Amino acid sequence: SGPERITLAMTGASGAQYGLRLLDCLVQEEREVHFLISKAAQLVMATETDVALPAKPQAMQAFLTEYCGAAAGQIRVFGQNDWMAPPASGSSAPNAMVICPCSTGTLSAVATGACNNLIERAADVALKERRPLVLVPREAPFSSIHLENMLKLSNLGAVILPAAPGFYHQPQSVEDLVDQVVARILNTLGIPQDMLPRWGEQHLVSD
Amino acid sequence: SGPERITLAMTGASGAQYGLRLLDCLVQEEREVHFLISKAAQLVMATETDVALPAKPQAMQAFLTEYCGAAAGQIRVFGQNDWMAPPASGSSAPNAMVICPCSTGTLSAVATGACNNLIERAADVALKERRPLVLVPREAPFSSIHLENMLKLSNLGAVILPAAPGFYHQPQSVEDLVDQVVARILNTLGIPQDMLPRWGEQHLVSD
Amino acid sequence: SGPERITLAMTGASGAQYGLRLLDCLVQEEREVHFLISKAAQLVMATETDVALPAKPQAMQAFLTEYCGAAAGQIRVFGQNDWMAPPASGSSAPNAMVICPCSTGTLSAVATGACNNLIERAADVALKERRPLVLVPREAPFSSIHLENMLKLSNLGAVILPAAPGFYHQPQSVEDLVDQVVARILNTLGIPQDMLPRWGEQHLVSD
Amino acid sequence: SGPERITLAMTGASGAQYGLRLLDCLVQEEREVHFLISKAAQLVMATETDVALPAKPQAMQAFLTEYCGAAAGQIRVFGQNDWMAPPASGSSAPNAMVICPCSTGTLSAVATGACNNLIERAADVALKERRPLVLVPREAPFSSIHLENMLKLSNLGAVILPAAPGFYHQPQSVEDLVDQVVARILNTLGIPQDMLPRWGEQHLVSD
Amino acid sequence: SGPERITLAMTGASGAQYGLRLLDCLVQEEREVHFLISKAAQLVMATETDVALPAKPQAMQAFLTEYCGAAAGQIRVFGQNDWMAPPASGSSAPNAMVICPCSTGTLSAVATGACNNLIERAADVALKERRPLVLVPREAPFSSIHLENMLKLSNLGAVILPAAPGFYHQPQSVEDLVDQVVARILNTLGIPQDMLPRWGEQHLVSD
Amino acid sequence: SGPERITLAMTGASGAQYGLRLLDCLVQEEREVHFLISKAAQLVMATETDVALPAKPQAMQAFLTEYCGAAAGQIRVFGQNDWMAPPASGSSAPNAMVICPCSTGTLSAVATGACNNLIERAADVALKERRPLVLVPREAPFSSIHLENMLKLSNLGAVILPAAPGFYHQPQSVEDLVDQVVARILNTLGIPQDMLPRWGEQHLVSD
Amino acid sequence: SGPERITLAMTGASGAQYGLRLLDCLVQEEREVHFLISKAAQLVMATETDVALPAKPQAMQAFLTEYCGAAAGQIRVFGQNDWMAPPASGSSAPNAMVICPCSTGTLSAVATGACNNLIERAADVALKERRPLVLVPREAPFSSIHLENMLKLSNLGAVILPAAPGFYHQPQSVEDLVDQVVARILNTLGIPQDMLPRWGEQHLVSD
Amino acid sequence: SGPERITLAMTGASGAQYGLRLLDCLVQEEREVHFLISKAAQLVMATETDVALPAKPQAMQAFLTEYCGAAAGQIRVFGQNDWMAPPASGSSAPNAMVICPCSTGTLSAVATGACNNLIERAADVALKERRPLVLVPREAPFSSIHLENMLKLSNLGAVILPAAPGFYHQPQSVEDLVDQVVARILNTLGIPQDMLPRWGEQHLVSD
């Protein structure tokens, strides 16, 4: 259940841990992942984590496959101008797409149709083909520029899913908070997850 | 520096820890706090924390004063229909106002001018007097209804500051994440804080 | 086929018979129903029908289970402030939601995001999770305020399904008219119904 | 009291019984009726009723006069391209106009100013002369296209009165439901009716 | 996979070959087709092709069945005012709908809700029932009137799929170009096709 | 007749054959062409054609001059950041400008004023000087993002001329289809062409 | 009085003399300046002035410090992708920001939220933190694209201060004109200047 | 080439030198000029220049004819309420119109259609007849009120040409700057000028 193939793009907002945890969960659910990452996101990851991600796609693909315990060819990695990759055309096989984290600059690019690199074109294709598109911005405050871009995209059917974890299961660790956002993304995609219980599911009637 | 008096309202989004930490920081900066809390927020706090907050304003005021180490009368607590309280009129002395957490229902009330209780009227007054108003929503996804309400209010000069902590100082605890959002709120108000360093302040020139 | 679980909310427009007939059909299709009812809707039902609906959720649940011939736990009843019930969070298991009848006040609440009670929050969650939301208003005239609220919600993907039965199968009773609207709701949800034939299904070619 | 002359147009939505009952009530209130009917409405009437309405205006006029017990010349019937009829020019004597039923296609024509036949031109004239215009759509769901057209026209002063009968007088027959809508139309026009009591008129003070 | 039943309407833009090729592919995928054609489209077909399409629905149905090699009753043909045909009511069994070619006049009719014939009403029903609607305009330049109509409909969930074939598989014939557009339509509907490969499907990693 | 100088920019939509055929026709009409091409368009041309276009402007200029049979200096080629070229300033001599093919990313850049390279700045100058600007997008579906960008630009006086060839002269080859679009572009510019007859020019009166 | 720290960005509009004169005045008022310059602005400066500005940030910093007579570390220079610099995060110490000259491309980037380099991100941060942002465009004509971008940003609280010097103090040199614009910028920031007298300050009453 | 007759209006923004230089260039190109000047512009000219312009139209006409070396009747001067002058009616012979300088008050009048004097009516006529209208505002900052007025007028086809001279030919005098704006106005009108070279005209290919 849910999509067999997910385009996962990481862009340069803070929150690299969310994208890595989501990649890991997707691999554990036996999904094929087309993995894309922006130059600024590579710097975020080097800044915020101890993951030493190689820069070139083939080396990055090898690295992420070992990091996640993925099967061979389960993770594809495509470079930022590789227009021969599936996500660049709506004639590709259907994927769901998630941008996590989603920088304000990528939010803006997708909202205006800029298509300046493969991540932006891929989201542009997702919208024109009416395939799932989930954006996970991380910023604060949100300015009116951010909010108008999110509103436009939500009105066009994108899911605006900010990295704003809930506290209602009493988190005990940073990892608990990361998992709550990742679980919400998986819920949105329709992919099984067991990190976030189904609210009130045992609640039969009011007190 | 910054406002001497802050109206701090807690409403029923998840994230009770943010409001309590902000209250604590405000008290430690010797600010007067006019504290307001919705019925649903009281349930969130009971659900997500071990804080046993008394229900009536006078008992709540005593409790919070001990919880924070506040001076006598530094924290005022007002009930949800107490139109005699300062926040209800623009002829009151100037306060900054923060709604943290800010539920989607309170976001909506403030965006449409509903003024159904003291928290909503207080924000309505803040906007009409052009006094600071900081809203800290916690929700995911944000629907187009949420986003249009945030956009309207941001366009009118409110600060939309979602509970979306950054990871770029490598948080080690839930408390580190809570402090990053609280530090941003204090920055927005112009109140000193030492939990979040000033980005790049020692960076003199590019490599 | 169609959703296993339906949140059915009744609010205070005239047309209590539509909600009761829909509840009955849903139970006969072996669906789980999370049943919600507003204080004004309780008065409509007492005014327009001979159904003596108990006021408290547990007694109401017992009553409706016998009224419909439902299996045990097939109908859940939740009170108007019970934020622990599944419909209040998008992390709940997926439901479709129907508000039938839908008062103009509830139409307005859902259109602005007011979330003042469980019915309003539940619809707010349905919209943010992109789950089905069917509103059945009953009013006449529709003012521009009603129409702008319906238009906003329809543009966001809600189904505006007014209680305006068709006459093209020559109804013979009030019950025939009620069934035509209920059949349309079930069609919209994708749930089998045999009260309303499929138009023109035997029509092979034009005369 | 109310208008002496009513242009009553029937167009091809389901609900032929509403137009016929309204015509009958208007005749019983000694009003002059300029009766117009679309080709699709003629098919609806043949489908949904046992009224065998002749096709040509003069024969239709004779038929409706006997059907209603009208006085001679009280009902005028005009064909769909008869630009010499009063409703086609604002220099005609003042009429109120009702389109009942109002198809979605006629709703659209009137909203955009299409004026493709006498019914559409007549409504266009009603709007430009600021004479009463009451539209009785019957459709479900209402799409955003329907809703934007109704909203535009309501904003211009038309009355959008959907065929959505209320149940709050406990209807016992289809005829009771038809009369509730017809009574609302007559109320809107300011014409006496005794089918629908005046709500709460004997209610002096609250319990 | 994909819809069992497709309403295929041809209207009077140039590109008759696209509609005929799509009809053929749909028949080869064992789909039921409800075929509709406008008077102007009949003239386009006579102008641009050597297909001698009979004018009356029954003869047209016989002709198209032989032209495509369809099974008996697989292709239904309905006339332009046949309101008894399934596409005219949302209570019909669910179809996807394609207008190919889509003239600018039909684009306009569907955008404003004109419902002047069965093709227009059928698309109006598709939108109100939230069933698939794919419009294939062929015009150049697109004026702002065309573009505002397409934008409105795309915002309401219609797919605007212009007859603008791609060249990236190096077409060798007019037929290759026609197949690229038809393949895109089938992709949009979710119907198998083998004329257009899935872009980059064998591309594992960037060079 | 028509402009003496045309800025022809090729960007990375499919349809490289259209730009090359247009360049050829312009040269055969003795027009001066300022030729610009994006990095992605160079990849399209290598993918979709057997034209081996050199990468550097001077070599590209030599190549295109031989390819077209142009006179010396009739084709100028400018690099993507060459702000000293005429198209970059409105104080240049007047040109008409055509972007053919026009990618969705360039459509977006021109619609928002991005001016990130010489093609984008050149179109920005064309709009501010009210000089002709013809955009030839090739995409399908057009999303609402594409359509809003085209609509904005058409409202500002740009010509949106999609690569959507007509079939009403019964094309026999891919080349016939390419020529129909190129002929429309030349018509739009006011430049003589003999590939597309003038519709109905010998038609004196209706049958 | 006025801000202690100013982010001064130069982008590629004509008017390099304005940015250099402003930098000089800021240094003479003992302000800290975080200096940013785009690649196109470097070409403008080389074209329009005899200032030989080194390309790398450290050499540029040394050069500008001598050019202005600045104290050590008073001018910081940051490269176009240096996300570790203060202006890139709202958690930095508060600055006012001026883009002078402001190209139409940078105007567009800031209006849409593109954040493609440090100048664009810095302005995006200024807007989200509600810190001063002054844009000094230099273009003529202003197209509707330019004007809509300026209007959006002015509505969000940016100051649109075009390089349009006044003549009402009878300028005698180009330098007089440059100083009038620079004086207006300093006035806007609240920084003392003595180049532009205060209009009418000695005017006590009308003649 | 270009218009034979120009309506040149001067209104009370700073920049009187621009209008006088433009008048002079127009006279040297043997154009007929219908010269209009507002009361506030007369005060600007007295303030900013040593031109002693007589107040009454006939004396002003004599003066300007000698100032420019104009032929007899080449410059017509019309008073501010002279509705018998050509510019007041669209039935006059075609002129291009320039308002230089254009005060913010005149910008506003023309944007709203105020027509309070001959300059405002003349621009209103230019817009309704679709004749050239060039506005040369001089103000800084531009407020959102200024920007919305300029945007409206630019969208209606007026040219918004702010007095914002470029520096890219290294001006040496105030006069050089004035000539750059005047040259742009003449370019916009299509009138020969030799003060501003054609950018890049000798640039054949990129380096």
Ligand SMILES: CC(C)=CCN1c2cc(C)c(C)cc2N(C[C@H](O)[C@H](O)[C@H](O)COP(=O)(O)O)c2[nH]c(=O)[nH]c(=O)c21
């Ligand atoms: C401490 C800073 C600079 C703030 C947190 N953060 C962030 C952290 C780090 C450590 C780096 C380096 C960069 C950021 N940014 C800025 C962002 O990368 C820029 O807008 C950039 O152009 C994005 O481009 P892409 O869309 O990825 O192609 C960024 N952008 C954003 O939208 N949200 C963020 O949290 C942050």
Ligand SMILES: CC(C)=CCN1c2cc(C)c(C)cc2N(C[C@H](O)[C@H](O)[C@H](O)COP(=O)(O)O)c2[nH]c(=O)[nH]c(=O)c21
């Ligand atoms: C697990 C649930 C139900 C989700 C997380 N969450 C939350 C947790 C708990 C534990 C409770 C009880 C309630 C919420 N809600 C719902 C919210 O309180 C309602 O909209 C309510 O009417 C708000 O009214 P006020 O504006 O405070 O007057 C709420 N609202 C919101 O905007 N964000 C939230 O995170 C949550």
Ligand SMILES: CC(C)=CCN1c2cc(C)c(C)cc2N(C[C@H](O)[C@H](O)[C@H](O)COP(=O)(O)O)c2[nH]c(=O)[nH]c(=O)c21
């Ligand atoms: C004869 C009357 C008062 C009209 C028919 N009708 C109705 C019947 C009865 C018998 C009662 C008592 C109330 C109504 N109302 C009014 C409605 O309940 C109010 O707006 C109310 O606040 C709704 O709140 P909720 O959204 O349910 O929380 C209501 N509202 C509405 O939208 N449509 C209706 O038909 C009617």
Ligand SMILES: CC(C)=CCN1c2cc(C)c(C)cc2N(C[C@H](O)[C@H](O)[C@H](O)COP(=O)(O)O)c2[nH]c(=O)[nH]c(=O)c21
């Ligand atoms: C079972 C069907 C097809 C649905 C109910 N219904 C209806 C019943 C019958 C039995 C017929 C024949 C037709 C309808 N229609 C379609 C409607 O007539 C078309 O839009 C038509 O062009 C209208 O043109 P006019 O505006 O009258 O000129 C129609 N239109 C509408 O707006 N509401 C309706 O209820 C229905």
Ligand SMILES: CC(C)=CCN1c2cc(C)c(C)cc2N(C[C@H](O)[C@H](O)[C@H](O)COP(=O)(O)O)c2[nH]c(=O)[nH]c(=O)c21
């Ligand atoms: C060479 C002409 C006239 C242009 C190409 N073309 C076309 C070819 C032929 C050969 C015919 C006869 C007609 C067209 N038209 C005009 C179109 O049919 C009219 O708008 C007409 O009212 C459409 O009504 P419908 O929506 O079908 O009911 C039309 N309309 C359109 O939108 N795109 C087209 O390509 C063309």
Ligand SMILES: CC(C)=CCN1c2cc(C)c(C)cc2N(C[C@H](O)[C@H](O)[C@H](O)COP(=O)(O)O)c2[nH]c(=O)[nH]c(=O)c21
């Ligand atoms: C099979 C693909 C990927 C689809 C057809 N096609 C295309 C073919 C080929 C073979 C390549 C390589 C690229 C495309 N693209 C994508 C496009 O180049 C990107 O948006 C790109 O950033 C454009 O940048 P520029 O505006 O030129 O600077 C593109 N873009 C577009 O708008 N229309 C197209 O047809 C296609």
Ligand SMILES: CC(C)=CCN1c2cc(C)c(C)cc2N(C[C@H](O)[C@H](O)[C@H](O)COP(=O)(O)O)c2[nH]c(=O)[nH]c(=O)c21
């Ligand atoms: C004579 C020309 C080309 C006109 C005056 N001028 C200018 C002069 C020179 C000498 C150069 C080289 C460039 C310009 N430009 C074009 C501008 O740099 C481009 O839009 C460019 O992408 C800007 O990118 P950035 O925003 O700086 O990153 C530019 N842009 C602008 O907005 N205003 C200007 O005056 C001019």
Ligand SMILES: CC(C)=CCN1c2cc(C)c(C)cc2N(C[C@H](O)[C@H](O)[C@H](O)COP(=O)(O)O)c2[nH]c(=O)[nH]c(=O)c21
């Ligand atoms: C130093 C001042 C007052 C600023 C520069 N300047 C100017 C200089 C002088 C010396 C005078 C006297 C007046 C101005 N004004 C104000 C302007 O004339 C008023 O809005 C006035 O009503 C205009 O009416 P009109 O449209 O001409 O009928 C004006 N208006 C404007 O739009 N731009 C300007 O530069 C200036």
Ligand code: NA
């Ligand atoms: Na681009």
Ligand code: NA
């Ligand atoms: Na209230």
Ligand code: NA
């Ligand atoms: Na509330």
Ligand code: NA
């Ligand atoms: Na007509």
Ligand code: NA
């Ligand atoms: Na019609």
Ligand code: NA
């Ligand atoms: Na740029």
Ligand code: NA
């Ligand atoms: Na970017």
Ligand code: NA
């Ligand atoms: Na006046």
